[PDB]
DNA sequence: AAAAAAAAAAAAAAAAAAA
DNA sequence: TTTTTTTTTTTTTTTTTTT
């Protein structure tokens, strides 16, 4: 059935190359080879986590006949009120070692042994502000002791937390910021999304003045909103036997947000 | 412009 | 009856050449001729014991008209909380001598006499962590006194035990590690197993995207899981008159684990 | 690629 | 390749003699021979840890044919929320003795035995404020019982912690403070760094009014910032085929912080 | 003025 | 006639946020 | 000035088992 073949596709996930994404990859790579720590900030739906995954995936673990995987980039996300015992466990699991029972100093001594030997060049911490302040002592120590760049990713609250401590604010002084789309960039994106992602039999011509007004008001430049809304509109539209997104269906979806 | 399927990048992971 | 002829086969055991296995054979052989001790570690279903058997079997005992068998490789597995009296008995039995009643010093003096004369070049100890700490004194002494390489095989707990004692950690410093399958290696293996082991009248084409997803999620790269699952699926499938493994039967089996 | 029957390797043992 | 030979150098680490550094060495040495305890404070990027290493390295362990190394200066850095058991372990490792299992009183009795015999004259504790308050009892006792000067190194928070306890505040009353560079001192440093560290084929003349303004605003007198920024600018500049740092590249780097 | 290579001071350590 | 592995065990302790 | 409530350590004399 053609209709289900398509619905199964539209309801999926993909990464679209964008300027923000390319910028980050080049910036982080600069930083990785210079071994310097930094942070990335921006508003909650700009597509920060995804830009980071896109990067991780371009640098796969490497494997020889004998020794452990070489793992240039490690990516983790901490739980709420994450403590020092919790971070060593995730670093150790990520690199595929078994975590056994012991106390904090034992997880620490073990984390430094697996981080060594196994080439690790960069550590990326998502939602950085979930960390308890005491953990930052352990994060800085690693960044200083091992040639590992540490990148903190987060929202504007992160800076409110970071500026509470001079020592940390200084390790992580350099930053890159993600923001909203606008003007020509938002319009060209919309067009990309139509030709590169939706691909309906006829298509809708969403760069017309009438449709961009609807999308602009509905999405306010967040890539997260634009994606959800166009996909909810294409699958609704197909379920009803249409070959394109029109104004009434698009407004019908937009009014639900 | 090529677009990457998210699940693909994951299924091909080390 | 064709059906039983086949079921009797699929329900059996075999050794498939794999890269991990070839690597170990060359590594151990290097070590054997240099007479150096070492250890092998890896996760519990990577196929360590089997790789070791495959090696043992390539070096059969040799026999002349008069003197005892020459036995280049000795392979033993200790019982739980194995003591010093228990090891000498297994070494002596392995080489086909009768064990008579006496005390520890008598089993020891006798073990060194049968280890001499009878050429023994390497001793492999499986499940090395079943040994009581006091036995390690006797293991090191043999490794130093006789030109015998001793190999300790085990899981990650082994290293937690070994690092408790400096003297042992140092005799057995060099190591090789087994791990999980992934990416191209897991996929090519799956294909090997289908053509080289299952051999159904039609076959299933398990390197297709749809089937690999099922197997990947079901097996997580352990060779032990992949083998059990494909064999349970081929015999179930034959019992039902099929000439290949399909998706519903494979999922039916996978959901039972 | 040749595959070895496990029981065979055992039955042929010294 | 000339370009890589140079990049490998600029991306390295070195200690530049500075007035702050010389002052500390003479001050601490005074204190060492008088056996008095003291503390060192200053802002987080003034180069306190490095000044201390520069000192440690001028007093190497000494060795005779028989007895243990004589070790005039011991330098340690505690982990977060460091307890009494943790300090004895680091002191013992530092002096190259094996630490065995026991309880707190056993690490303590052993720490005093290795501190004796082995000449130790000064103990330097970096990041002093990571210590738990209960440890200070053990630190004072050592300072009083053995002719060992104890130096506490840290930031302004250290004093907020120290003034919580009269007994400690009094042992460690004397202090030296590190601060920012300014005026002629900052300008002469910049010049030192160019001739003594960067060494580009042509050089940039960074003591000119135009360049100092850029650096002053970018670095605010911290030696830690000045070093990072000039090195990031020299390697960026070389990668682009230049023989000196210009204004656009320097501003290009400064704007990233 | 002489400058010390950091790694040098370390490699030459007791 | 002497070594070895738990046995949980209940306190004991700051220690943080809100109102 | 007040109220939860939350995670971490620390030693700790007993009990049973065996060769
Ligand atoms: N190249 C891309 N292709 C497709 N979607 C993208 C792309 N970049 C961003 N997105 C959308 O971003 C959304 C995920 O947003 P997400 O990345 O979670 O926001 P964020 O950047 O993580 N900040 P936060 O979500 O607060 O952590 C998904 O809807 C993605 O489709
Ligand atoms: N090389 C191989 N060819 C075919 N089957 C294998 C191979 N290696 C392992 N197997 C199967 O996969 C499992 C191997 O298990 P096993 O070798 O016992 O794990 P291991 O390597 O011994 N680690 P452990 O079992 O914890 O000691 C068994 O089911 C084998 O039949
Ligand atoms: N004397 C120096 N010569 C050359 N570089 C220096 C010197 N002092 C500091 N630096 C550079 O600046 C950094 C010094 O910072 P550091 O020594 O870590 O200060 P700090 O004392 O650690 N402060 P804290 O945050 O309090 O640890 C190092 O990266 C050095 O390169
Ligand atoms: Mg420091």
Numbering used by the authors:
A (entry chain D), C (entry chain J), E (entry chain E): 19 to 275
B (entry chain d), D (entry chain j), F (entry chain e): 570 to 583
How do the authors describe this structure?
pmcCRISPR-associated transposons (CASTs) have co-opted Cas genes for RNA-guided DNA integration and are promising candidates for novel genome-editing methods. Despite remarkable diversity, all RNA-directed transposition systems characterized to date share multiple components: a CRISPR effector (Cas12k or Cascade), proteins dedicated to target capture (TniQ + TnsC), and a transposase called TnsB. By analogy to work from prototypic Tn7 (2), TnsB carries out transposon end recognition, pairing, and the chemical steps which result in integration of cognate element DNA. We determine the molecular mechanism of TnsB recruitment to the target site (via the AAA+ regulator TnsC) and the structural details of the TnsB transposase.
Atomic modeling into this density indicated that this portion of TnsB most likely corresponds to the last 15 residues of TnsB (the last residue is not modeled), or residue positions 570 to 584, which we refer to as TnsBHook. The lack of additional density corresponding to TnsBCTD in our cryo-EM reconstruction suggests positions outside the structured TnsBHook do not make specific contacts with the TnsC filament, which is consistent with TnsB disorder predictions. Deletions of either the TnsBCTD (ΔCTD, or equivalently TnsBΔCTD, corresponding to residues 1 to 475) or the TnsBHook (ΔHook, or TnsBΔHook, corresponding to residues 1 to 569) result in loss of transposition activity. TnsB’s C-terminal hook interacts with TnsC along the surface of the filament, but interaction via the TnsBHook alone is insufficient to stimulate TnsC filament disassembly, indicating that one or more additional interactions between TnsB and TnsC not visualized here must be required. A total of 50 residues (520 to 569) are not observed in either our TnsBCTD–TnsC structure nor the TnsB STC structure, and are consistent with predictions of disorder based on primary sequence.
